[PDB]
Ligand binder design. Structure first.
Ligand SMILES: Cc1cc2nc3c(=O)[nH]c(=O)nc-3n(C[C@H](O)[C@H](O)[C@H](O)COP(=O)(O)OP(=O)(O)OC[C@H]3O[C@@H](n4cnc5c(N)ncnc54)[C@H](O)[C@@H]3O)c2cc1C
Ligand SMILES: *[C@@H]1O[C@H](CO)[C@@H](O[C@@H]2O[C@H](CO)[C@@H](O[C@@H]3O[C@H](CO)[C@@H](O)[C@H](O)[C@@H]3O)[C@H](O)[C@H]2NC(C)=O)[C@H](O)[C@H]1NC(C)=O
Ligand SMILES: *[C@@H]1O[C@H](CO)[C@@H](O[C@@H]2O[C@H](CO)[C@@H](O)[C@H](O)[C@H]2NC(C)=O)[C@H](O)[C@H]1NC(C)=O
Ligand SMILES: CC(=O)N[C@@H]1[C@@H](O)[C@H](O)[C@@H](CO)O[C@H]1O
Ligand SMILES: *[C@@H]1O[C@H](CO)[C@@H](O)[C@H](O)[C@H]1NC(C)=O
Ligand SMILES: [Ca+2]
Length: 613
């Protein structure tokens, strides 16, 4: 471990390793150090040997497990959330669903920053982010036989001729009843989309897997941004170390700070000297933890924590958002026939599963295990799924106009004019986005419809108005934070859930599902028809997290509660940036990992262009 470094990156995760990669290749004379809580682990993909249709990988890398506080507005249910504890971060333990949000979701970032963000040239709208999306991954056309078998569609214009060893691929396998819902979504008027990673994604979407096109092995940041670029002499990595905080010897206006690190083996604490900048990429859950212990956070929490205030930025750990939603479930009253193979074949058929195990080891990889978690989702806009009803967005706009919107934030947040102002800007922008018929409001993925385990649809609330907190355990500040999800704390989220579930129920009415005798098992017509009963149902049967927590160090002006500018520097701190999913101001209508790379690539480009002064 060297005397000093030019760059320290806190967290060897998805964004952090892509930043560390791009910095070391651009500045061969500058030394980068990545400090990682975890270690290097082989990363099994989703549904790899010897699992059954979606069982846990026996040799999975380590992760943090989180149980949030009870969410009273969702029947006190707890949210269960994971975070990868490994070189590669969460992308090493992903479900590998590798989509991007619509162009309008990222346009929303620029709009929510407002004019306070406009004397910078770093635009995080679609036009400013799309080139880095193309840079971030290499996509590969599937074989022709696989195309004519499963009917993948795509448009290479969405990917360009990028060549970064982070792979987006379509498996050479699908379950045999994959076309079932595909046909039924079209009978609901949801239309096929040829390519959904090129910004235009409302309709029925093919989504790729973050995995190698030949071997089907998981692609994560630890390979593509770390292992695959070594040897590289200025690219250092320190494992089994927890970065405690950053310290400014002469205050935050004289930087970069020192990185105070704790060795997880022996608890030995030390400091790393930084010449250039410190980049924090500890993730949406842990970046707030690193800045809070650095005295960079809500002044009142920091006082209650016995931590001296270095920067009073109440956005640190605030504005927590995640994807969540309740299900619609059915059985079949006729036998589920004519499909081979279905997922149950893995548990019914030793021959078939033995072959799947060995098919995965052939070159190229073959059979069921080349599949990750599935490659399909609908993304339906609020106008489309409700027949242009303006009730929800009127409620949002009114709730800002009358000033009651603030009441839905936490009691130590609604009192802060900065936070109310930024929450209000979010809601109006979200109100506009949910009025855009090309902007997804509901996501529903599927790969099979075999009953009973996969005869269900989930109603992903893509753009929640509720907001939560990531805060230090005050008993053990170095332990994992407390997550207060406050799911459903803004009531428009419940209205969205009812609209989404009620749209989804139409699935069972489709000729395709009626041919199969699909019989609704939950919520049922009785519940669905009662705003009070369906409300009760979404509040107690929703999954509170699909493991996409974000926006705890939002890219917003300080007066709107943000923590970083559009250059991703922490407001009021020189030589200190954040680059991970905590910087998004609004949660995107997508799974986050592809965005995490794109954010890493653009943040690296920003950092590079300035250090070539
Ligand atoms: C179970 C699960 C499944 C998912 N499935 C999908 C999916 O199918 N599709 C999708 O698009 N997204 C998915 N995601 C989410 C997506 O992968 C993440 O949002 C994204 O990878 C996060 O990137 P990041 O760089 O912000 O964080 P991470 O990649 O998690 O990076 C944080 C890193 O910092 C390290 N760290 C934490 N604290 C410290 C500290 N104090 N000092 C040093 N290092 C520290 C962590 O160990 C980790 O390496 C999933 C997430 C989970 C948890
Ligand atoms: C990492 O670097 C920081 C910055 O140098 C170290 O923090 C500094 O620690 C010194 C202790 O040597 C603190 O000074 C102390 O102040 C109290 C009262 O103010 C006084 O009673 C002590 O005698 C001593 O002078 C100093 O405040 C502190 N600096 C900051 C900005 O917090 C930190 O210890 C280093 N960490 C490790 C593990 O080396
Ligand atoms: C158990 O699974 C194996 C698949 O590995 C089945 O064997 C295949 O059956 C299909 C018929 O759907 C044929 O097209 C293939 O030629 C067979 N391949 C091999 C390698 O056997 C087998 O039929 C399954 N058993 C049952 C009872 O369904
Ligand atoms: C609410 C909460 O999780 N509090 C935790 C406690 O459960 C844990 O035992 C302790 C030790 O790290 O730190 C704090
Ligand atoms: C939430 O917390 C506790 C449950 O043990 C109780 O205070 C409250 O009634 C709970 N709310 C609901 C709706 O269950
Ligand atoms: Ca697999």
């Amino acid at each position: 471990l060297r005397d000093d470094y030019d760059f320290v990156i806190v967290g060897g995760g998805t964004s952090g390793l892509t930043v560390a990669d791009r910095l070391t290749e651009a500045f061969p004379a500058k030394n980068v150090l990545v400090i990682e809580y975890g270690d290097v682990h082989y990363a099994p993909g989703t549904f790899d040997p010897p699992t059954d249709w979606i069982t846990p990988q026996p040799d999975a890398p380590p992760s943090w497990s989180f149980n949030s506080l009870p969410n009273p507005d969702m029947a006190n249910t707890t949210a269960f959330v994971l975070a990868g504890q490994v070189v590669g971060g969460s992308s090493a333990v992903n479900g590998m669903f590798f989509d991007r949000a619509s162009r309008h979701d990222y346009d929303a970032w620029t709009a929510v920053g407002g004019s306070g963000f406009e004397q910078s040239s770093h635009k995080w709208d679609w036009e400013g982010l799309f080139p880095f999306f193309q840079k971030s991954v290499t996509f590969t056309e599937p074989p022709a036989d696989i195309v004519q078998k499963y009917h993948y569609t795509w448009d290479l214009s969405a990917y360009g001729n990028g060549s970064t060893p982070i792979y987006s691929s379509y498996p050479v396998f699908q379950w045999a009843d994959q076309p079932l819902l595909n046909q039924a979504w079209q009978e609901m008027g949801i239309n096929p989309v040829t390519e959904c990673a090129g910004g235009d994604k409302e309709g029925v979407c093919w989504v790729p897997a973050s995995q190698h096109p030949v071997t089907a092995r998981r692609s994560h940041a630890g390979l593509g941004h770390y292992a695959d670029v070594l040897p590289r002499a200025n690219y250092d990595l320190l494992v089994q170390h927890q970065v405690v905080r950053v310290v400014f010897p002469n205050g935050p206006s004289h930087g970069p700070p020192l990185v105070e690190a704790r060795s997880l083996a022996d608890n030995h604490l030390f400091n790393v000297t930084v010449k250039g900048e410190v980049i924090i990429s500890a993730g949406a859950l842990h970046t707030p933890t690193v800045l809070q212990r650095s005295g960079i956070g809500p002044a009142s929490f920091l006082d209650d924590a016995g931590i001296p205030v270095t920067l009073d930025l109440p956005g640190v750990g605030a504005n927590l958002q995640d994807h969540c939603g309740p299900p619609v479930t059915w059985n079949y009253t006729e036998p589920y026939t004519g499909f081979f193979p279905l997922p149950s074949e893995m548990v019914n058929n030793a021959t078939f599963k033995a072959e799947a195990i060995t098919g995965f080891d052939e070159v190229p990889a073959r059979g069921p295990y080349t599949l990750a978690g599935g490659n399909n989702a609908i993304f339906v806009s609020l106008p489309h799924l409700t027949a242009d009803y303006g009730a929800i967005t009127a409620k949002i706009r009114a709730m800002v106009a009358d000033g009651t919107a603030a009441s839905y934030l936490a009691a130590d947040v609604r009192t802060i004019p900065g936070m109310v102002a930024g929450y209000e800007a979010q809601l109006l922008v979200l109100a506009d986005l949910l009025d855009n018929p090309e902007a997804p409001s509901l996501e529903t993925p599927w790969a099979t419809s075999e009953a009973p385990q996969t005869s269900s649809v989930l109603a992903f609330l893509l753009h929640p108005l509720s907001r939560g907190s990531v805060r230090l355990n005050l008993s053990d500040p170095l332990a994992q934070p407390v997550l207060d999800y406050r799911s459903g704390s803004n009531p428009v989220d419940i209205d969205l859930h009812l609209a989404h579930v009620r749209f989804l129920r139409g699935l069972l009415d489709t000729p395709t599902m009626q041919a199969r005798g699909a019989l609704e098992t939950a919520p049922g017509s009785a519940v669905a028809d009662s705003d009070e009963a369906l409300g009760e149902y979404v509040r107690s049967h929703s999954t509170l997290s699909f493991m996409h927590p974000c926006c705890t160090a939002a890219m917003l002006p300080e007066d709107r509660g943000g923590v970083v500018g559009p250059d991703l520097k922490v407001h009021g701190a020189e030589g200190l940036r954040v680059v991970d999913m905590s910087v998004m101001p609004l949660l995107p209508g997508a799974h986050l990992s592809a965005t995490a790379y794109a954010v890493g690539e653009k943040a690296a480009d920003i950092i590079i262009q300035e250090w070539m002064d």
